[PDB]
Amino acid sequence: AIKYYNAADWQALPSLAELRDLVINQQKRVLVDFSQISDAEGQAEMQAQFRKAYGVGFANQFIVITEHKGELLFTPFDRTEETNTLPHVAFYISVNRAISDEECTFNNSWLWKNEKGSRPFCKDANISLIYRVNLERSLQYGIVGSATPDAKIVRISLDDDSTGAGIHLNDQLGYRQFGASYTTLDAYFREWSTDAIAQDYRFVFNASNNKAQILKTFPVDNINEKFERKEVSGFELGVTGGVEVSGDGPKAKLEARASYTQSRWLTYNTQDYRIERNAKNAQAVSFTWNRQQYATAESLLNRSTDALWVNTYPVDVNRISPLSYASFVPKMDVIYKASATETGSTDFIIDSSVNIRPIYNGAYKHYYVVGAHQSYHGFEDTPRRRITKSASFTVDWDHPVFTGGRPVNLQLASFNNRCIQVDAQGRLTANMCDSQQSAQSFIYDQLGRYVSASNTKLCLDGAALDALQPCNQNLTQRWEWRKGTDELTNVYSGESLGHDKQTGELGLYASSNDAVSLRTITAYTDVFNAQESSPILGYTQGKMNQQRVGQDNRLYVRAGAAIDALGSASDLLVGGNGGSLSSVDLSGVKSITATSGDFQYGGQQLVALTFTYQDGRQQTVGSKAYVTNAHEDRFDLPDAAKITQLKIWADDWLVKGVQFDLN
Ligand SMILES: CCCCCCCCO[C@@H]1O[C@H](CO)[C@@H](O)[C@H](O)[C@H]1O
């Protein structure tokens, strides 16, 4: 049931929430058509409205929108072919390309190219992939040298949790035999052309301009053949944090108070292939799965000589691993960054391909005089054909999600609690509050400015309160709340934002009068469900890192006389480098008890965590043998509660405290 839409009709457009509800909640498959628009100006306008509304744009004529893993899935074409922790836009890009017989066709023979004809070397060859994309902001957190970056992020990846079907070339590898059309005494007389495999699989990532640079990727370098392992690619972003470290709520200025490690799980099983990483420059990087094991036709020979009366296929096709033609599922993670103040747009292109390689071997007839025989050989300089499928998406660096802040409103208490709202021209009015109206949403940024969420280029300016103004560095655009009151003050003049109780007109005042109120109420416009969690066990000292509990549902630790580090994976440990690695199962945990006190080797420390499970079993990390004047904080998990996130406080040497979030 595809719900067709002619974009030309909107030149008179549904919000993101509306689209997600129709596609995700109502499982409706949507098809947006841009090919009916009459001219370039009209197309550019709608394209601009489309991406401004949904956070992503395309230049393609058709866009199919479906659901995938709880997010929107965009399938563009031209012809008939965590949120509580980090604000972000997540979606997927689908790519499906059928490889035609013509595209898989090669000569039946190599030695006799123009004689034996040609045939398709693959059956139902296909490329079906799904790319996960996240648009998000990272704030600077930590000391210069070991801090998270202050940067707008575009993260693209092919991971275990959202992967598409993969690349297919053949179900099985068959062959055909051929022979010289002339007499032979000492020369090649027979040949076998085997169905094609992938000499390589390649994925190229590039950005359309220099506004974006590659920050990190996974793999970070080359990966050898016969490499089998589930890897984790973690990227640490500075975030504003919640109640555990930002006691001001909606009035808190955009500031990093913790870091968060967003992880992508990547399963590798390279077998015959080695993975070669190549970063040509700051905008482009490619990952190529190249045959390393049994890479030549010669290597496939399972016999070398025979008498002339033997006519047997001299190849052992079982030496070829199935990921070479049956099913291949790539895994990678690419993280692009742009400056904190970047503007405009950037396109990201993904080139996915398979280098199709037919296989040729021949038999050489040797003449000795008294006795003759044949020898088998492989031909390597034979034809290969790369079939590529590209896709691109456009990103606007001014999208509100890139501010890293949460939308909030400004309510005039004495004016029937109305919300300040901005129209297209930037004029201000006061209307009934409505969370579904972005025109009432603002981001309270780093400078203390109130940036319109519906147009990040405009700001609340004391210089002219009749309309928002192009954001700048002037103090007239920075606001500061007076603690203990509902009064919002202007940094430049020190006055308070007041509103006439009857007309709603805005102005700056030294104090309220009979006709004017200085009471401004602000609230988050997004509805956030309460997060249940244990108290902070231990001490709230040092930096805090947040990590989601992995699929393996285990807590990783390095400890000795105290607790050196903790993490959701052995490769994502936070804390010092001492202690010895250990692991704790989180399923069945009924209660957790932390031990803190005077540490034998200095100061106060969290020295141990004891976990008690439903069956009574207990496991402890750290020790109680090097602490005196100890104190025990015990947390009992609510019935059926499961640990899903970890908040870890640590300094350069030890974990200082931890908090466990539930469900
Ligand atoms: C941190 C200062 C430790 C001084 C001597 C400690 C002897 C106990 O053992 C030590 O405990 C440390 C803390 O967990 C670990 O980091 C060390 O690897 C471990 O050997």
Side-chain angles (χ1 to χ4, degrees), residues 1 4-27 30-40 42-78 80-101 103-113 115-122 124-171 173-184 186-220 222-242 247-252 254-273 275 277-279 281-307 309-320 322-367 371-380 382-456 458-482 484-526 530 533-542 544-550 552-589 591-613 615-616 618-633 635-638 640-641 643-663:
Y4 174 85
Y5 290 72
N6 187 315
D9 303 323
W10 293 305
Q11 300 194 65
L13 186 68
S15 75
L16 178 59
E18 303 189 63
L19 171 57
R20 301 180 81 280
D21 170 62
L22 176 60
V23 173
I24 301 175
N25 299 308
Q26 302 173 52
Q27 294 292 300
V30 180
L31 185 168
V32 191
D33 191 323
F34 288 74
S35 76
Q36 305 305 318
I37 299 181
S38 66
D39 60 329
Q43 279 186 292
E45 178 53 39
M46 291 314 296
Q47 295 176 329
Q49 277 175 48
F50 182 102
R51 61 176 188 280
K52 167 193 175 185
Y54 313 131
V56 64
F58 309 83
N60 308 92
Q61 304 303 295
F62 302 109
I63 308 179
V64 170
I65 312 179
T66 56
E67 181 278 322
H68 182 65
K69 298 298 171 179
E71 309 286 1
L72 297 177
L73 171 76
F74 298 88
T75 299
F77 55 107
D78 300 310
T80 305
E81 312 171 60
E82 178 178 292
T83 55
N84 280 281
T85 308
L86 172 67
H88 68 305
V89 168
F91 59 83
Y92 296 90
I93 303 295
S94 183
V95 117
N96 299 73
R97 191 197 190 300
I99 299 175
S100 66
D101 287 320
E103 294 175 301
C104 266
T105 294
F106 300 78
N107 282 149
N108 278 313
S109 172
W110 168 245
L111 293 166
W112 305 297
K113 305 170 191 175
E115 297 189 60
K116 316 304 180 172
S118 58
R119 75 170 194 283
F121 280 64
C122 338
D124 303 315
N126 173 290
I127 299 176
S128 287
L129 304 168
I130 295 183
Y131 313 117
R132 184 205 294 254
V133 180
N134 281 189
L135 304 187
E136 44 193 31
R137 169 65 173 283
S138 174
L139 302 174
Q140 195 175 77
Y141 181 68
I143 71 171
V144 179
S146 59
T148 54
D150 186 17
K152 299 181 180 189
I153 306 289
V154 171
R155 185 172 194 180
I156 307 174
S157 42
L158 288 71
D159 53 272
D160 305 336
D161 296 305
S162 62
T163 177
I167 299 169
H168 177 66
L169 290 186
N170 276 299
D171 288 315
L173 302 176
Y175 71 84
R176 288 185 177 188
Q177 186 255 303
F178 298 96
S181 61
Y182 47 83
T183 291
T184 57
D186 194 76
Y188 282 112
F189 75 120
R190 268 183 205 149
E191 182 187 54
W192 296 266
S193 58
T194 300
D195 294 323
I197 61 180
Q199 198 59 42
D200 79 52
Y201 292 114
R202 196 174 79 190
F203 309 85
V204 186
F205 299 80
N206 202 195
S208 69
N209 56 49
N210 62 22
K211 280 161 146 48
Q213 290 182 55
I214 289 169
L215 178 50
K216 67 150 68 177
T217 73
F218 194 110
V220 309
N222 300 335
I223 294 184
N224 295 317
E225 67 288 344
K226 296 189 178 181
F227 176 75
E228 176 166 42
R229 179 189 305 172
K230 193 187 192 182
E231 294 286 48
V232 73
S233 183
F235 174 52
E236 190 178 0
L237 308 86
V239 293
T240 53
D248 298 311
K251 293 180 175 179
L254 183 292
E255 178 184 60
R257 304 192 182 73
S259 69
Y260 166 65
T261 300
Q262 188 181 57
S263 293
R264 297 289 186 245
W265 293 88
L266 315 169
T267 295
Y268 288 98
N269 176 23
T270 68
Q271 289 188 290
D272 304 342
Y273 305 75
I275 301 175
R277 172 178 189 285
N278 189 191
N281 52 47
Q283 287 71 59
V285 62
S286 69
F287 296 100
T288 307
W289 266 255
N290 273 90
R291 287 190 73 70
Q292 173 56 38
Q293 227 64 189
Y294 293 116
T296 66
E298 172 87 345
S299 73
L300 303 177
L301 299 170
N302 70 333
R303 60 171 59 218
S304 57
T305 64
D306 274 308
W309 53 77
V310 170
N311 192 338
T312 301
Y313 182 55
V315 166
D316 182 357
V317 77
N318 291 324
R319 295 176 172 181
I320 300 170
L323 49 31
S324 315
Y325 60 79
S327 181
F328 172 73
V329 185
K331 303 291 185 181
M332 62 210 77
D333 188 34
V334 173
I335 306 177
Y336 281 99
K337 69 169 180 178
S339 84
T341 60
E342 189 56 77
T343 184
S345 300
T346 299
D347 283 8
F348 297 85
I349 176 169
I350 306 172
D351 298 309
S352 300
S353 66
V354 50
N355 199 16
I356 303 182
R357 184 266 170 85
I359 302 174
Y360 305 86
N361 302 77
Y364 192 89
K365 177 190 299 186
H366 299 285
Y367 175 64
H373 74 94
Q374 65 180 305
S375 61
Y376 308 109
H377 307 276
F379 306 127
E380 207 47 31
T382 54
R384 293 142 156 63
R385 186 173 305 124
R386 182 178 303 285
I387 299 307
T388 303
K389 175 53 183 182
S390 301
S392 305
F393 60 90
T394 301
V395 170
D396 291 327
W397 300 109
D398 295 301
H399 182 291
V401 71
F402 287 123
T403 65
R406 296 177 204 299
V408 292
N409 53 30
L410 295 170
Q411 305 169 44
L412 311 183
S414 301
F415 192 62
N416 192 29
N417 298 287
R418 282 188 171 181
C419 273
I420 290 182
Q421 189 181 307
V422 68
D423 62 38
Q425 292 52 275
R427 304 296 299 184
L428 291 182
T429 56
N431 308 303
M432 185 181 274
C433 293
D434 170 23
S435 294
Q436 306 315 305
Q437 177 47 281
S438 61
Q440 298 180 355
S441 294
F442 297 81
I443 284 89
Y444 190 31
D445 76 19
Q446 341 81 52
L447 301 183
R449 296 182 301 187
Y450 269 105
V451 176
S452 171
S454 71
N455 193 327
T456 58
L458 302 171
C459 280
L460 182 64
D461 196 341
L465 296 166
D466 58 284
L468 300 187
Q469 307 298 312
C471 302
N472 62 41
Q473 309 299 124
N474 299 0
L475 301 190
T476 58
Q477 295 186 345
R478 309 189 189 180
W479 306 82
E480 188 68 55
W481 288 96
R482 168 174 290 118
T485 70
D486 297 297
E487 296 173 41
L488 181 56
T489 74
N490 186 274
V491 181
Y492 181 67
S493 73
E495 295 160 306
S496 300
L497 181 66
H499 58 281
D500 178 288
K501 308 181 189 179
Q502 297 165 285
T503 74
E505 202 179 308
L506 301 183
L508 294 171
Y509 301 76
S511 71
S512 66
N513 59 48
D514 300 312
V516 175
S517 168
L518 308 178
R519 279 173 53 68
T520 300
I521 303 307
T522 180
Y524 286 117
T525 51
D526 297 311
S533 61
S534 76
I536 292 173
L537 303 179
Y539 307 94
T540 291
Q541 280 192 314
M544 184 279 266
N545 176 250
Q546 199 170 317
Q547 293 179 34
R548 291 189 71 68
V549 175
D552 75 339
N553 194 41
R554 301 184 72 73
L555 166 64
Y556 291 87
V557 186
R558 244 191 297 108
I563 303 176
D564 302 89
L566 295 179
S568 61
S570 56
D571 277 319
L572 301 175
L573 295 175
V574 307
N577 307 308
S580 37
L581 185 57
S582 173
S583 173
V584 177
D585 191 318
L586 296 180
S587 58
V589 172
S591 78
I592 305 175
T593 291
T595 303
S596 303
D598 300 315
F599 190 52
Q600 188 181 318
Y601 305 107
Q604 291 68 66
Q605 312 289 344
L606 168 64
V607 294
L609 289 167
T610 296
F611 302 76
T612 302
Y613 303 74
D615 61 28
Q618 296 186 302
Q619 203 186 316
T620 292
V621 295
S623 178
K624 307 186 176 183
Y626 310 76
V627 71
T628 62
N629 308 311
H631 169 55
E632 307 211 313
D633 303 320
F635 175 64
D636 290 296
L637 282 67
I643 299 172
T644 52
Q645 285 193 58
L646 309 177
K647 285 172 190 162
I648 312 160
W649 279 264
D651 57 25
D652 307 318
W653 309 81
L654 299 165
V655 165
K656 288 288 175 173
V658 55
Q659 175 171 60
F660 307 80
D661 297 322
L662 305 175
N663 307 309

